[PDB]
Amino acid sequence: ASKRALVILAKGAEEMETVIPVDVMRRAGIKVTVAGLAGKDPVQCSRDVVICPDASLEDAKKEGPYDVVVLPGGNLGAQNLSESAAVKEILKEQENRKGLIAAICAGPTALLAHEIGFGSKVTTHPLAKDKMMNGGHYTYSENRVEKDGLILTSRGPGTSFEFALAIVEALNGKEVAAQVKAPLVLK
Amino acid sequence: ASKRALVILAKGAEEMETVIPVDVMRRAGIKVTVAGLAGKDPVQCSRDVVICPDASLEDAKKEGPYDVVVLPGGNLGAQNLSESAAVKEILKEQENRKGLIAAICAGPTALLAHEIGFGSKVTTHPLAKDKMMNGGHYTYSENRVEKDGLILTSRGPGTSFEFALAIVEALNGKEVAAQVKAPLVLK
Numbered sequence: 001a002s003k004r005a006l007v008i009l010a011k012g013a014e015e016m017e018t019v020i021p022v023d024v025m026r027r028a029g030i031k032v033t034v035a036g037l038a039g040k041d042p043v044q045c046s047r048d049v050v051i052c053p054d055a056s057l058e059d060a061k062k063e064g065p066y067d068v069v070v071l072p073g074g075n076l077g078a079q080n081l082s083e084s085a086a087v088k089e090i091l092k093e094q095e096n097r098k099g100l101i102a103a104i105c106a107g108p109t110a111l112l113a114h115e116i117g118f119g120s121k122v123t124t125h126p127l128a129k130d131k132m133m134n135g136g137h138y139t140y141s142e143n144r145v146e147k148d149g150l151i152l153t154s155r156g157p158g159t160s161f162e163f164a165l166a167i168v169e170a171l172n173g174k175e176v177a178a179q180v181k182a183p184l185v186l187k
Numbered sequence: 188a189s190k191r192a193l194v195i196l197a198k199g200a201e202e203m204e205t206v207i208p209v210d211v212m213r214r215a216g217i218k219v220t221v222a223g224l225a226g227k228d229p230v231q232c233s234r235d236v237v238i239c240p241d242a243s244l245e246d247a248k249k250e251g252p253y254d255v256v257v258l259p260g261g262n263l264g265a266q267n268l269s270e271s272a273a274v275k276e277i278l279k280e281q282e283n284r285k286g287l288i289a290a291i292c293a294g295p296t297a298l299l300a301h302e303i304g305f306g307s308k309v310t311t312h313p314l315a316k317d318k319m320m321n322g323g324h325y326t327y328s329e330n331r332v333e334k335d336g337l338i339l340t341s342r343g344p345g346t347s348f349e350f351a352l353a354i355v356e357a358l359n360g361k362e363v364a365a366q367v368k369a370p371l372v373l374k
Contacts, residue, residue, distance in 0.1 A: 156372030
């Protein structure tokens with residue numbers, strides 16, 4: 001009965017957008033796999049924090065499926081996610097099984113790259129809006145967290161707690177999210 | 188020319204309270220050294236995120252001093268900081284030279300262990316108040332961020348952005364902190 005999350009960690013990922021969801025989800029009793037896009041080696045993030053993944057994405061894929069697939073932002077990280085055929089297949093399969101997909105900041109641009117969730121209302125970091133909206137395949141929102149069915153998106157480092165808690169609430173319900181939230185000392 | 192920050196990373200540290208200040212400070216142009224209390228090896232944080240430090244604390248001591256010394260929380264992390272003579276040394280030197288010391292969540296309890304800043308007004312996580320106030324060596328505050336001279340404290344993961352921006356403002360001024368703040372999409 002524990003819910004499961006896959007967080008895909010690429011070189012250049014935004015480390016706050018990676019660690020806040022991982023930590024908050026684990027606080028909720030979600031079993032989170034931090035999966036390295038490139039393999040099991042440590043990953044240099046956007047502001048040079050170095051994070052060691054739990055597993056390679058190839059190994060993590062065999063242990064799925066997952067209740068949520070999470071895409072951090074960072075412009076290089078999102079570019080790396082967007083160029084990956086391995087990411088494409090995991091996102092398609094996740095949409096095809098009606099599992100949640102959650103992406104933050106520049107992360108939603110990988111949904112565009114991989115043709116995931118076309119027609120959804122989405123948000124992104126303001127500086128990623130133009131890229132996301134190229135071809136008109138989505139509807140744009142200014143909400144800090146936007147959820148359209150199983151496509152959950154959010155805007156930036158400063159929306160990461162909100163984004164993480166939305167994932168927790170989607171998976172484990174409102175009371176678990178509230179119980180995780182209170183010790184955080186959010187405003 | 189750039190200001191310099193030391194972030195001390197012990198086993199069991201709160202990974203959000205580590206990464207948010209590192210990332211925000213680097214966005215502000217501060218040179219941040221993530222120093223592993225126990226050497227250069229990867230550090231397993233409170234919710235099992237594994238972070239590779241930039242340097243050992245032993246080397247970082249030699250490479251100092253710093254414009255700010257930062258103590259993340261996490262109860263095991265704070266306990267390890269509290270039991271380290273090296274941390275003591277660094278904090279006493281920083282206090283002596285009138286440099287900023289910044290501690291969040293359970294982190295300020297290491298100030299207590301090392302007899303730093305006695306008589307200051309401080310905040311902590313609510314659950315760390317008891318420990319911090321044992322013996323009456325500080326005055327307690329319920330402000331999200333508290334600053335009494337060069338002792339800067341804060342309360343939890345959800346105050347980490349405010350804590351980090353307060354460090355930026357102290358080192359680089361109000362306009363740099365505002366400029367760093369805007370792209371984060373804080374509320």
